[PDB]
């Protein structure tokens, strides 16, 4: 059992809303993996001074090769020195089209499946809304321009419109009645049954959550889910550079630039696999076009304003449209919110005047205003919404430079032992 | 509400304005100051370009209870200082109220570019409210 120093530095960059891999390391069953990443994160030069900080999220997952390669892997390992070589997957014939999984597309335009499948699995088990279509892309070449290079899009920071109730949420439960009578005992079960359905719809869409519900547990191997080993996050701040020449004097450019550590406590790697670490930069969804729900309603009813408890706990959800939340709110986008939820949270305010001011990372256009009457598309972060405020994405929206200190104890003959025959 | 103190290179001490300085002005005799009626004076009496149609009723010898800010005329036409380079209410007419209320245009002069109006601010409003409120779960759950 000896130390293998896999420390290495990395220079990266990506688009706002998209989730990018920043460092992946292959591990072996028996490995004791430790990772201390430290460095600084920045964003392409801004147009004006600094407005608000971006929330940066770093993740480190562990994925058994078995999760990727399936039973085909168990054999690979079982057959040992005979095993049918594991198949690789395909990327498009472009260098960058492998980015989402932290690597340049190799000479042969094909990268190892575990990189690709892991990225998916990670995305489907933690980043997409449980109700959104599960990402299934077979190969890195079924991926489109933006995705393959920048990573999949993730959800905006949770707020009233970005974190609604799953669209298929029941708004009424019908129960069969005879013609002149009703089974009150049936009506009973009816409700109970509804309950089980809601419990699920609301927060138990994933198998594990259902089991946990009974007060049980589930190995990560049960539903084949990446293992979240470590998750840190922080706010990216910086400074303004002052203009000093005849015409620039009195102008300011914001240079976001935050240092940070992302430490992963010693971890025991039970089976051969990959340790993937990804980042995700986002800006809180501030919009000069959003207003308090109550300022929007035209006919203010008791059931709205009053905030009568008796009601708030027994009414069904409420279907409202983005129109109800933004002046330019797309009306075709319907979201189901919880009653009087506008009394459980206050929205951020931006004087309209910032509306057309190039340079602030605000949503100067009602969310999903150019994706169509599609909710999911509105909820996921459209990185173009930001092209506006950057002086020049020569390094995309953001970028970072960090040193990844990695120490791994493992059964490994010494290089000498490898090169020496006798 | 943001405001700039009404400094003007065009204002002068009331007493420097009066033409015929009387005992009742200068002397500051108590016996008088406490028994005379208010005094009607016009902005002309306070500014060189003071609009004379603007009449204000002040308290006697009030010019002895307060000293006015001074700005060397030279700053008169210097673009950049938040002073009232024009006697208050000089472009609203012989209307007192209009002179008294703050005309924000009086300031357009000193700003390089109101891309964000005269002023602007960015703050975080931390608000905590205790209230009778069922939990979101209780709202979305029927049974």
């Amino acid at each position: 059992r000896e130390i293998v120093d896999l420390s290495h530095l990395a220079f990266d960059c990506g688009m706002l809303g998209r989730l990018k891999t920043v460092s992946w390391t292959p591990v072996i069953a028996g490995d004791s993996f430790e990772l201390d990443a430290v460095g600084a994160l920045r964003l392409s030069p801004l147009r004006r001074g600094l407005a608000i900080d971006s929330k940066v999220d770093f993740f480190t997952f562990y994925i058994p090769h078995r999760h990727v390669y399936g039973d085909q892997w168990i054999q690979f390992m079982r057959d040992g020195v005979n095993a049918q070589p594991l198949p690789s997957v395909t990327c498009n014939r472009y260098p960058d089209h492998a980015g989402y999984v932290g690597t340049i597309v190799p000479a042969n335009n094909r990268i190892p499946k575990f990189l690709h499948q892991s990225y998916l699995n990670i995305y489907n088990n933690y980043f997409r809304a449980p109700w959104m279509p599960e990402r299934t892309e077979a190969n890195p070449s079924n991926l489109n321009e933006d995705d393959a290079r920048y990573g999949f899009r993730c959800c905006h920071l949770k707020n009233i419109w970005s974190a609604p109730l799953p669209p298929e949420t029941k708004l009424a439960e019908e129960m069969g009645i005879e013609s002149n009578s009703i089974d009150i005992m049936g009506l009973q079960a009816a409700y109970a049954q509804l309950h089980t359905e809601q419990e699920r719809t609301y927060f138990m869409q994933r198998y594990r959550d259902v089991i946990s519900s009974f007060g049980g547990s589930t190995s990560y191997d049960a539903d084949n889910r990446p293992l979240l080993v470590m998750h840190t996050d922080f706010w990216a701040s910086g400074y303004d550079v002052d203009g000093t020449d005849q015409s620039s004097l009195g102008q300011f450019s914001g240079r976001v630039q935050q240092t940070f550590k992302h430490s992963v406590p010693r971890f025991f790697v039970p089976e051969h696999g990959v340790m993937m670490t990804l980042a995700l930069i986002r800006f809180p969804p501030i919009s000069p076009l959003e207003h308090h729900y109550l300022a929007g309603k035209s006919q203010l009813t008791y059931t709205d304003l009053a905030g009568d408890p008796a009601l708030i706990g027994n009414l069904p959800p409420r279907e409202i449209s983005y129109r109800d939340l933004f002046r330019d709110g797309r009306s075709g986008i319907k979201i189901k919110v919880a009653e009087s939820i506008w009394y459980r949270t206050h929205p951020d305010y931006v004087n309209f005047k910032y509306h057309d001011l190039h340079g602030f990372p605000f949503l100067d256009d009602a969310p999903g205003t150019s994706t169509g009457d599609n909710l999911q598309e509105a909820i996921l972060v459209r990185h173009q919404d930001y092209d506006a405020c950057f002086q020049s994405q020569q390094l995309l929206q953001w970028n970072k430079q960090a040193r990844y200190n990695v120490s791994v104890y493992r059964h490994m003959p010494t290089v000498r032992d490898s090169i020496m025959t006798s | 509400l943001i405001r700039f103190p009404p400094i003007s290179p065009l204002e002068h001490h009331y007493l420097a304005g009066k033409s015929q300085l009387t005992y009742t002005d200068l002397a500051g005799d108590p016996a008088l100051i406490g028994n005379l009626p208010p005094r009607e004076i016009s902005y002309r009496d306070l500014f060189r370009d003071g609009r004379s149609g603007i009449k204000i009723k002040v308290a006697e010898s009030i010019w002895y209870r307060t000293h006015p800010d001074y700005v060397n005329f030279k700053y008169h036409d210097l673009h950049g200082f938040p002073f009232l380079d024009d006697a208050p209410g000089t472009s609203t007419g012989d209307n007192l109220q209009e002179a008294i209320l703050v005309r924000h245009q009086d300031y357009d002069a000193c700003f390089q570019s109101q891309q964000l109006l005269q002023w602007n601010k960015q703050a975080r409003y931390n608000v905590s409210v205790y209230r009778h409120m069922p939990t979101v779960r209780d709202s979305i759950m029927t049974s």
């Binding site: 600094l50 407005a51 608000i52 900080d53 929330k55 999220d57 933690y126 980043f127 997409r128 809304a129 449980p130 109700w131 993730c154 959800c155 920071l157 949770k158 707020n159 974190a163 609604p164 109730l165 799953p166 719809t201 609301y202 927060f203 138990m204 869409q205 994933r206 959550d209 706010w235 701040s237 910086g238 914001g254 995700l280 809180p284 919880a338 939820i341 459980r344 949270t345 951020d348 | 960015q122 703050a123 975080r124 939990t135 979101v136 779960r137 979305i140």
Partner: peptide, 26 residues
């Protein structure tokens, strides 16, 4: 009146749960 030199604003961030969406979403 506060001395400090202007800082950019961070997170809009508490009581019980608000966002039910079917499971965990980052």
């Amino acid at each position: 009146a506060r001395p400090g030199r202007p800082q950019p604003l961070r997170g809009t961030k508490k009581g019980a749960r608000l966002w039910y969406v079917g499971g965990q979403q980052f």
